[PDB]
Design an enzyme around this catalytic site. Structure first.
Site, short mmCIF file in Angstrom:
data_model
loop_
_atom_site.label_atom_id
_atom_site.label_comp_id
_atom_site.label_asym_id
_atom_site.label_seq_id
_atom_site.Cartn_x
_atom_site.Cartn_y
_atom_site.Cartn_z
N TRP A 21 0.82 -1.21 0.00
CA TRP A 21 0.00 0.00 0.00
C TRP A 21 0.85 1.26 0.00
CZ3 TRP A 21 -5.26 1.48 0.24
CH2 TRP A 21 -5.49 2.80 0.68
N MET A 22 0.42 2.26 -0.77
CA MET A 22 1.01 3.60 -0.76
C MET A 22 -0.10 4.65 -0.83
SD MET A 22 3.51 5.55 -3.54
CE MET A 22 2.40 5.16 -4.88
N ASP A 40 -0.66 9.13 0.67
CA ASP A 40 -0.32 10.54 0.62
C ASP A 40 1.13 10.81 0.34
OD1 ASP A 40 -2.69 10.03 1.96
OD2 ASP A 40 -2.45 11.73 3.33
N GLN A 97 3.08 7.80 2.42
CA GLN A 97 2.44 6.87 3.36
C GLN A 97 2.58 5.45 2.83
OE1 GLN A 97 0.50 7.99 6.51
NE2 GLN A 97 2.27 9.22 5.91
N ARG A 115 -4.29 16.96 12.35
CA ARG A 115 -3.42 16.42 11.30
C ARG A 115 -2.79 17.43 10.36
NH1 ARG A 115 -8.18 12.38 9.39
NH2 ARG A 115 -8.58 11.83 11.59
N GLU A 142 -8.34 18.23 5.41
CA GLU A 142 -7.07 17.55 5.59
C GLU A 142 -6.08 18.17 4.63
OE1 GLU A 142 -8.20 13.54 4.64
OE2 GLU A 142 -8.60 13.05 6.75
N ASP A 158 -12.22 15.69 3.35
CA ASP A 158 -12.25 14.33 3.87
C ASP A 158 -13.53 13.56 3.56
OD1 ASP A 158 -11.05 12.15 5.56
OD2 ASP A 158 -12.76 12.63 6.86
O1 LIG Z 1 -2.59 7.86 5.88
C1 LIG Z 1 -2.69 8.97 6.77
C2 LIG Z 1 -3.05 10.24 5.99
O2 LIG Z 1 -4.19 10.00 5.15
C3 LIG Z 1 -5.17 11.05 5.26
C4 LIG Z 1 -5.45 11.64 3.88
O3 LIG Z 1 -5.57 10.61 2.89
O4 LIG Z 1 -6.42 10.58 5.81
C5 LIG Z 1 -6.37 9.50 6.75
C6 LIG Z 1 -7.65 8.68 6.75
O5 LIG Z 1 -7.72 7.94 5.51
C7 LIG Z 1 -7.79 6.51 5.53
O6 LIG Z 1 -9.09 6.09 6.00
C8 LIG Z 1 -9.58 4.76 5.71
C9 LIG Z 1 -9.07 3.75 6.73
O7 LIG Z 1 -10.13 3.38 7.63
C10 LIG Z 1 -9.28 4.28 4.28
O8 LIG Z 1 -10.46 3.75 3.68
C11 LIG Z 1 -8.68 5.40 3.42
O9 LIG Z 1 -8.33 4.89 2.13
C12 LIG Z 1 -7.45 5.96 4.13
O10 LIG Z 1 -6.80 6.94 3.30
O11 LIG Z 1 -7.63 7.84 7.92
C13 LIG Z 1 -8.69 8.17 8.82
C14 LIG Z 1 -9.33 6.90 9.36
O12 LIG Z 1 -8.51 6.35 10.39
C15 LIG Z 1 -9.68 9.03 8.03
O13 LIG Z 1 -10.20 10.10 8.83
C16 LIG Z 1 -8.88 9.57 6.86
O14 LIG Z 1 -9.66 9.52 5.66
C17 LIG Z 1 -4.53 12.12 6.14
O15 LIG Z 1 -5.47 12.72 7.03
C18 LIG Z 1 -3.41 11.41 6.89
O16 LIG Z 1 -2.29 12.27 7.10
#
Ligand SMILES: OC[C@H]1O[C@@](CO)(OC[C@@]2(O[C@H]3O[C@H](CO)[C@@H](O)[C@H](O)[C@H]3O)O[C@H](CO)[C@@H](O)[C@@H]2O)[C@@H](O)[C@@H]1O
Ligand SMILES: *[C@@H]1O[C@H](CO)[C@@H](O[C@@H]2O[C@H](CO)[C@@H](O[C@@H]3O[C@H](CO)[C@@H](O)[C@H](O)[C@@H]3O)[C@H](O)[C@H]2NC(C)=O)[C@H](O[C@@H]2O[C@@H](C)[C@@H](O)[C@@H](O)[C@@H]2O)[C@H]1NC(C)=O
Ligand SMILES: *[C@@H]1O[C@H](CO)[C@@H](O[C@@H]2O[C@H](CO)[C@@H](O[C@@H]3O[C@H](CO)[C@@H](O)[C@H](O)[C@@H]3O)[C@H](O)[C@H]2NC(C)=O)[C@H](O[C@@H]2O[C@@H](C)[C@@H](O)[C@@H](O)[C@@H]2O)[C@H]1NC(C)=O
Ligand SMILES: *[C@@H]1O[C@H](CO)[C@@H](O[C@@H]2O[C@H](CO)[C@@H](O[C@@H]3O[C@H](CO)[C@@H](O)[C@H](O)[C@@H]3O)[C@H](O)[C@H]2NC(C)=O)[C@H](O)[C@H]1NC(C)=O
Ligand SMILES: *[C@@H]1O[C@H](CO)[C@@H](O)[C@H](O[C@@H]2O[C@@H](C)[C@@H](O)[C@@H](O)[C@@H]2O)[C@H]1NC(C)=O
Length: 524
Positions: free
Chosen positions: A24-25, A27, A43, A150, A205, A238
């Protein structure tokens, strides 16, 4: 659920987009240019092709295309980031120091800001990274939820040694950008005035604030400000999982960013890209004086297939950001010129005619690693999202191209123009018949694109296996999507010029380059 084959699945890997060896990759993280190298972090889940166990992968390139893998930058190895090393940005100080700000998550899902920096600034590859001994450095203020705190932006300079950073969040349903001041990147003081706020958008975000020139053709250093300067404010919305931007002005003394057009504010207006495109981050490129934008495209197939193939998601080819001087109301996104170094050979199609309801094959050989530039002319309410795609015939549309298509059109991906009634020009990408498989996305994506008197309808397409990137009118509107065909793969994938209009015939000139591998491998 489709019985995907090993040959069908391996074909999905990209030839020239950035993609880790496996897994997985997500942000883009802290993009910078340092000591002759483009640095990219991202990420990364070491364990599975799903989101989680977040770490920062690291890669480098001389040209933003030919990437080389380096060891993990940041791991989930401290109590304050044990649940994951979430996304962040870099600020480069004038003394030569690099400050990397990120969010670390605790076992209790608490999100707090932390500082990292290179262990050895003399190393151009910036291989090793150190976490500030006094982490974590900043926790949520009284008005913001500690589980939703964040995404620190790249900072901008004020005066007297003080820098500013943006952290997006929300008040109830209002999206907001907070601004923290710092002098040492270890202590942060919350400013009372918000950068900006927009009702009914929700969580912001990955907030990005940067300046753009109104006269030149170069990007601007992030700290640049003036009366001749406009400022783009961008947020990842988001709730929608889509990136929105707006064009406006920013005042240092007031700290307020103000939109040029309130009706097209952050979250309720334009996007960088009308397809799958998220968590976009910009950095200033000093070597060619550009502002370049990074953004990842998620898989649009099933998680079952992701696990089967062992990897998930790609980054788009990085794009330049410039203000559209001809409208003043949008940006221009265009693939970095270095993508052209992947071009092997060209084929030209001069003044090809396509009548009403017709389909014209374009023999290019293999049609899976392509750079296509096309111009369209018409010879002598609508909404892409709710349209029937290329099947919905109108008087002046739809016309354009069919990528990832099969000989007998059983699988196809139309990228097309549609002129509807003054004229609104639509640019859409149609997924509804991309694949015979039913466990993939089938939506139609797109928006209006401005077309000015004297301009031909132009499109650029980057075809790279399971990912298509489309550009209308020199980048006034972009659409990125993923395709997962079952038959239109390897030698069987074809390219077509098509016109499904009723009222007119179209005349298109094209040029098509086959594209090499970016040869993305480990560093030597
Ligand atoms: O990876 C952390 C990074 O991603 C950000 C922006 O993409 O959002 C984080 C977030 O995304 C994930 O959420 C779900 C996992 O349950 C998944 O379906 C999705 O593809 C992911 O990108 O994670 C939280 C959930 O724990 C969400 O609020 C958010 O969408 C960023 O905020 C962060 O720096
Ligand atoms: C997010 O949403 C909550 C819930 O609606 C907001 O809190 C509410 O604020 C109202 C004030 O705008 C309160 O209503 C009235 O207060 C006045 C004060 O003189 C009185 O005349 C009258 O008796 C009303 O009660 C309401 O009590 C309050 N609701 C709750 C459940 O707490 C919230 O506003 C923010 O918090 C409150 C406590 C105040 O400090 C506001 O100034 C503050 O903005 C909304 N959040 C934001 C950031 O707007
Ligand atoms: C073109 O047609 C599409 C599809 O109908 C429109 O996008 C859709 O907008 C809906 C709201 O008008 C969204 O549906 C729901 O909104 C409610 C709000 O009451 C939410 O509570 C709920 O969660 C739903 O999301 C929906 O998100 C969206 N659908 C898709 C597939 O994207 C589109 O509207 C435009 O796009 C959306 C994303 C927003 O930016 C709108 O402001 C914008 O107008 C239609 N465009 C038109 C008619 O101009
Ligand atoms: C140009 O427009 C025409 C007219 O809409 C497109 O042809 C149509 O294609 C759709 C989608 O494949 C067909 O619908 C199908 O109907 C069959 C049963 O007839 C059903 O089994 C499928 O599930 C699907 O719903 C439709 O038959 C067909 N209509 C006509 C009049 O030909 C055509 O594909 C467009 N050209 C392109 C996209 O290049
Ligand atoms: C994070 O690492 C742990 C420990 O190395 C893995 O077990 C996680 O995999 C997930 O959790 C296990 C127990 C199992 O349910 C598996 O199906 C999961 O994928 C891993 N977490 C993620 C999100 O990949």
């Amino acid at each position: 659920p489709y019985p995907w084959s090993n040959a069908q699945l391996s074909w999905q890997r990209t030839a020239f987009h950035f993609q880790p060896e496996r897994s997985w990759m997500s942000d883009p993280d802290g993009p910078i240019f340092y000591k002759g190298w483009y640095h990219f972090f991202y990420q990364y889940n070491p364990d599975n092709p799903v989101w989680g166990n977040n770490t920062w992968g690291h890669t480098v390139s001389r040209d933003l295309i030919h990437w080389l893998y380096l060891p993990l930058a940041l791991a989930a190895d401290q109590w304050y980031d044990m649940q994951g090393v979430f996304s962040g940005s870099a600020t480069c100080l004038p003394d030569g120091r690099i400050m990397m700000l990120y969010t670390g998550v605790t076992k209790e899902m608490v999100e707090m800001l932390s500082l990292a920096y290179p262990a050895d600034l003399s190393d151009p590859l910036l291989v090793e990274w150190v976490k500030y001994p006094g982490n974590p450095i900043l926790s949520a203020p009284p008005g913001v939820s500690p589980t939703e705190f964040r995404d620190a932006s790249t900072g901008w300079y004020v005066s007297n040694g003080t820098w500013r950073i943006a952290i997006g969040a929300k008040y109830n349903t209002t999206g907001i950008a907070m601004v923290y001041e710092t002098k040492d990147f270890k202590s942060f003081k919350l400013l009372e005035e918000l950068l900006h706020a927009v009702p009914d958008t929700g969580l912001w975000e990955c907030v990005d604030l940067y300046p753009v020139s109104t006269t030149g053709e170069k990007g601007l250093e992030t700290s640049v400000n003036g009366p001749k300067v406009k400022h783009v404010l961008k947020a990842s919305i988001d709730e929608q999982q889509r990136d929105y931007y707006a064009i406006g002005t920013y005042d240092l003394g007031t700290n307020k960013w103000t939109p040029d057009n309130p009706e097209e504010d952050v979250g309720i207006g334009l996007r960088y890209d009308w397809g799958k495109y998220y968590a976009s981050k910009t950095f200033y490129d000093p070597k060619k004086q550009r502002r370049v934008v990074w953004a990842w495209t998620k898989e649009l197939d099933s998680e079952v297939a992701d696990r089967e193939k062992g990897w998930a998601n790609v980054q788009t080819i990085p794009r330049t950001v410039l203000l559209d001087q001809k409208t003043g109301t949008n940006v221009l996104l265009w693939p970095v010129e270095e993508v052209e170094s992947l071009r092997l050979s060209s084929k030209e199609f001069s003044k090809v005619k396509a009548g009403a309801g017709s389909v014209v094959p374009l023999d290019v050989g293999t049609a899976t690693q392509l750079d296509i530039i096309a111009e369209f002319e018409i010879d002598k309410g609508y909404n892409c999202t709710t349209s029937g795609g290329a099947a919905e015939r109108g008087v002046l549309g739809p016309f354009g191209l069919l990528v990832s298509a099969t000989e007998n059109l059983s699988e196809q991906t139309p990228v097309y123009f549609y002129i509807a009634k003054n004229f609104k020009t639509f640019f859409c990408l149609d997924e509804s018949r991309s694949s015979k498989a039913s466990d993939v996305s089938k939506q139609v994506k797109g928006f209006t694109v401005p077309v000015l008197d004297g301009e031909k309808f132009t499109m650029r397409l980057l075809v790279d296996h399971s990912i298509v990137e489309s550009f209308a009118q020199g980048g006034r509107s972009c659409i990125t999507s993923r395709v997962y065909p079952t038959e239109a793969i390897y030698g069987a994938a074809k390219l077509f010029l098509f016109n499904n209009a009723t009222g007119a015939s179209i005349t298109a000139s094209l040029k098509i380059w086959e594209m090499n591998s970016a040869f993305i491998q480990p560093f030597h």
